[PDB]
Nucleic acid binder design. Structure first.
Length: 231
RNA sequence: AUCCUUAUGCACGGGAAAUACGCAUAUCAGUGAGGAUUCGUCCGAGAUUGUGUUUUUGCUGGUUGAAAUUAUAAA
């Protein structure tokens, strides 16, 4: 309640089961959300699980909007804007992500060049990038908020277990944190695209119910050793 | 109040069939449709036309393949 921009929480709640349909459904939902947003002049972030996912998502987005309307994302006349784009498009953008950037729905992830990543970060800040597909780096690191924040999916793979776990509350909260800009905009759009069964669990997490539970059992021994060494 | 008959409506349940099942600004039709016949008579409700699907509508599930793919980060 004491937050600068109040966070409008939202869940999709996917009913589908099989992964080929489910994914499609999720994509559709995302598109719908994006459509709802961009018409209001809303700059938007789409979190995903993995690095490889992001680019594909971006590609999908590109193929969907061009059928209906290319114009709403590049609306400006672009005499100076175009020039700017030219300047900051084909410098060192290697990963075949340059096309995405050109389109105007780019991405930032661990596995994009330090220069490239920086550019991506600033291509929002300067005031041009509409949509931003993202891994969970941005939430952890960078302060840059972006009105609409969609979290695509539940199942992250952790090598800790060696299994597809649900999105952990501590990360989800962090992700949600970046939203409507405290300085400029009034409020924030927070969306979770998810499986319907795990929403019941997620709702509680969203209300900040699950506390700080200690994980000192793994890191105890080393600490103890260090202490001993210290004398 | 108890038991039954008929029709219907809603359903459990069990079957068969979809070569069937509709629809119509149509034409006609118990003031006769279409049929029987031992030829005396008898049954009595659709027919014509047009047309929409019709080896099938709607949904689910699996195996598969398809190639099915794993977050960040400090020392």
């Amino acid at each position: 309640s004491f937050r600068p921009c109040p966070l409008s929480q939202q869940f999709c709640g996917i009913k589908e089961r099989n992964s080929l349909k489910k994914l499609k459904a999720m994509n559709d939902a995302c598109y719908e959300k994006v459509l709802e947003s961009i018409n209001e002049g809303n700059q938007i972030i789409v979190f995903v699980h993995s690095r490889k996912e992001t680019s594909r998502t971006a590609t999908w987005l590109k193929n969907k909007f061009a059928e209906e309307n290319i114009t709403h994302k590049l609306t400006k006349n672009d005499a100076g804007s175009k020039q700017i784009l030219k300047t900051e498009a084909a410098n060192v953008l290697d990963p075949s992500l340059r096309k995405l950037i050109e389109s105007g729905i780019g991405t930032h992830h661990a596995g994009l060049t330090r220069s490239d990543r920086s550019l991506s970060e600033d291509l929002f800040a300067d005031g041009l990038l509409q949509v931003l597909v993202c891994t969970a780096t941005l939430a952890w690191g960078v302060n840059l908020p972006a009105h609409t924040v969609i979290i695509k999916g539940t199942d992250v793979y952790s090598p800790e277990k060696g299994s597809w776990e649900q999105l952990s509350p501590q990360d989800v909260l962090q992700m949600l944190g970046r939203a409507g800009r405290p300085r400029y905009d009034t409020f924030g759009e927070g969306i979770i695209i998810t499986d319907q069964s795990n929403v019941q669990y997620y709702l509680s997490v969203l209300n900040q119910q699950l506390p700080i539970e200690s994980q000192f059992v793994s890191k105890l021994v080393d600490n103890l050793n260090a202490e001993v060494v210290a004398g």
